[PDB]
């Protein structure tokens, strides 16, 4: 019976491959062949944020495109005013081992998590004037690798126990569990409508999950190593994954297979973070070679390099209005680029 | 100045946050970072109990005006290479292994836990992140190994062992096998201590090893090393 189930599974996988091949007549390199190239992209460092003393592991911008939050291994979650480099807040974390942080769309709450397997939500707007631990979510048996706010009360997180989770914050209970990944889920991205979300794990696969239904929609397998980053296209009909095989890959949800590959022979190091520009034409990816490349998402040709960090670029984000791109590295510095 | 009154007050608040961060960093930099590692039932529990007497578990204690933090990853059931780099820069790595494991095969199967501990030690010591971090090797359960070696010879673990079935010689052999797994002979040093269930010199040995590491790091900083 087990062998019959395995042969049914492999027949189904072959059917998936055949169906994907059938709906593949012209590549993205052929559709976007006569379009004008983006050209050389010159982005300069406008602000440098100092105050972190250990390697910085994550950051998130926020909807207002002015504030930002950064988490560092020195046990500090610092909320910066990017326009004036002022430190709006400095939260001392209970556990110094933080690897992810999220800033709520409303801005009233901020999230973090890490090796303590607990997602801590802090209330920034308190009548006491300080920042207090609003809630601690527990239940993941592995390290918390990513977290993203749906709203003030719902949060989606990914953990190293091959599991994603949707939590109701006021109750503190794990509302929904997303399972199916066979490797540690390293990053997740939320769709613009906050109805679906993609999660990339260490099994070299990405999965699309329906938030409301709680079940996986599609699985995309094009990478050859652990996927460290993921990010939707601005229209929510495609996404990009960076992995350890020194390649980025643009997949799309509605055709259900890979569209484009972003790789160069002179790059051997893996990708730590990716994000899309406001129009989606530029894909920014941070690498382990201390640099940050900017690729043409439509032509796959590299457009620029953001080389200003002295250590591994660990986190990278783009504002909602797209005005600037912020990169934080292991040298305890964030840099804003325009 | 073009700043408003509220802007100047915000800048003053930022400067206060800056000096508080500097004070916190000064306090934290005066503290020893120890990463506790080992196989299953290696003896990490008795080690942390001894240090207390004199996700991730943090153990803070004091000895000779030094503050020590041990980070026992322990029950972190995830493949290690995605978060081991978080521990790069620790003062030392305390690697605990049980001697009596030399003839025990229930690893999870049909292979010695001793060899699994050897492979874990090889992975940690020769890791790309811990090229200069020093290892403090703890060989626990010496008292029970004393009586176990008299019935099951060491050849159950090492087929090439030819020495006498004596505690000192076989223990030296095991220490030599662990030290040979070090490929960074020039950048890092391995400190070995032979501990038991009822000894109180373990914290003194950790103090000595940390002091030696501090001296070596200072010599590197001065350029004299």
């Amino acid at each position, epitope marked *: 019976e087990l062998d019959q189930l395995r042969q049914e599974a492999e027949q189904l996988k072959n059917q998936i491959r055949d169906a994907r091949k059938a709906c593949a007549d012209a590549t993205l390199s052929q559709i976007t062949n006569n379009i004008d190239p983006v050209g050389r992209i010159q982005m300069r460092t406008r602000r440098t944020l100092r105050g972190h003393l250990a390697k910085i592991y994550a950051m998130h911008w926020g909807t207002d495109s*002015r*504030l930002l939050v950064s988490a560092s291994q020195d046990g500090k979650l610092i909320i910066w*005013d990017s326009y*004036t480099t*002022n430190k*709006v*807040h400095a939260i001392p974390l209970r556990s110094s081992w933080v690897m992810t942080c999220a800033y709520a769309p409303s*801005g009233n709450y901020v999230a973090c998590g890490g090796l303590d397997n607990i997602c801590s939500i802090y209330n920034l*707007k308190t*009548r*006491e*004037g*300080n920042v207090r631990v609003s809630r601690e979510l527990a239940g993941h048996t592995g390290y918390l690798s990513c977290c993203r706010f749906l709203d003030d009360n719902q949060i989606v997180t990914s953990s190293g126990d091959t599991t994603c989770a949707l939590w109701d914050i006021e109750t503190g209970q794990q509302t929904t569990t997303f399972t199916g990944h066979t490797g540690d889920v390293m990053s997740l991205s939320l769709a613009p409508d906050t109805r679906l979300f993609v999660s990339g794990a260490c099994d070299a696969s990405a999965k699309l999950w329906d938030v409301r239904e709680g079940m996986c929609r599609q699985t995309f397998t094009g990478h050859e190593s652990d996927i460290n980053a993921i990010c939707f296209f601005p229209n929510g009909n495609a996404f990009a994954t960076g992995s350890d095989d020194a390649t980025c890959r643009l997949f799309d949800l509605r055709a259900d297979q890979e569209l484009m590959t972003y790789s160069h022979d002179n790059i051997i190091c893996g990708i730590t973070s990716v994000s899309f520009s406001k129009s989606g034409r530029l894909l920014l990816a941070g690498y382990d070679d201390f640099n940050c490349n900017v690729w043409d998402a439509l032509k796959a040709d590299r457009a620029g390099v953001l080389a200003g960090h002295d250590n591994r670029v660990s986190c990278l984000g783009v504002t909602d209005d797209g005005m600037a791109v912020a990169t934080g590295s292991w040298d305890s510095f964030l840099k804003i680029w325009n | 100045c*073009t700043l*408003s*009154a*509220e*802007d*100047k*007050a*915000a800048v*003053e*608040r930022s*400067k*206060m946050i800056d000096r508080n961060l500097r004070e916190d960093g000064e306090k934290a930099a005066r503290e020893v970072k120890l990463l506790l590692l080992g196989a299953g039932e290696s003896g990490k529990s008795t080690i942390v109990k001894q240090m207390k007497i004199i996700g991730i578990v943090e153990t803070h204690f004091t000895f000779k005006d030094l503050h020590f933090k041990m980070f026992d990853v322990g029950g972190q059931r995830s493949e290690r290479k995605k978060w081991i780099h978080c521990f790069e820069g620790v003062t030392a790595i305390i690697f605990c292994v049980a001697l009596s494991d030399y003839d025990l095969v229930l690893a999870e199967e049909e292979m010695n836990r001793m060899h699994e501990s050897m492979k874990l030690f090889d992975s940690i010591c020769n890791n790309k992140w811990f090229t200069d971090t020093s290892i403090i090797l703890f060989l626990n359960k010496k008292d029970l190994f004393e009586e176990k070696i008299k019935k099951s010879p060491l050849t159950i673990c090492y087929p090439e062992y030819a020495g006498s079935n004596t505690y000192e010689e076989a223990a030296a052999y095991i220490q030599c096998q662990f030290e040979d797994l070090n490929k960074r002979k020039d950048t890092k040093e391995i400190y070995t201590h032979f501990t038991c269930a009822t000894d109180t010199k373990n914290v003194q040995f950790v103090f000595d090893a940390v002091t030696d590491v501090i001296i070596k790091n200072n010599l590197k900083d001065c350029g004299l090393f």
Partner: single-chain antibody
Amino acid sequence: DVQLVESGGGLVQPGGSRKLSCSASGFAFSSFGMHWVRQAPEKGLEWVAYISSGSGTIYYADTVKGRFTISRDDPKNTLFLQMTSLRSEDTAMYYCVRSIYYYGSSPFDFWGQGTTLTVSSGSDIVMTQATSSVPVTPGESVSISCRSSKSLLHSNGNTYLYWFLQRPGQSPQLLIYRMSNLASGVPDRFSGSGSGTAFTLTISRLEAEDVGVYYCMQHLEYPLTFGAGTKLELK
């Protein structure tokens, strides 16, 4: 909740000295700047003194500079005002006001109950509230106007205008900060608008508890000045 108590007021002979203590509870006193504000018996508010968090910066009004000294003891969460050479014009209700300053913050958030002091017997922005009082009817719409001698709009785009309401027998309560934002706990009936040197505060479907004196404050140039106030009365 957060609460401030002022103590140390009473009958004082002219030229004497007096000590006022404001005790704070329910909030992080060390991280809040503190203001001493004065209201004469039949007059409006008048900013007196300010001490920042950590006592880094200290400011006084010109009428009280030199004689008055503002200080704070953070471990005891208390604020001190030492007054020397008291004049007959210093008799008033004194309020200690908490005020935190960061991006998006709401300064002058909470006001103390105030303590009564009874002394026995230029180049600053003038904020003008031309109308002394208006009669209103519950359920109607009323607009309170304000005018400034100098434009309150800064190069950063913020218009530093603050609106306060002082119900009879109670301390002033913040309604609008920076001319647009609504303070926490304030009903959405109050709306703040204006531009440059002209400002207005509009109340939609005013209720019975909206009766009081509305004060207009500026925060651009630091010698804070208040408006004369506009009293609302029922018919």
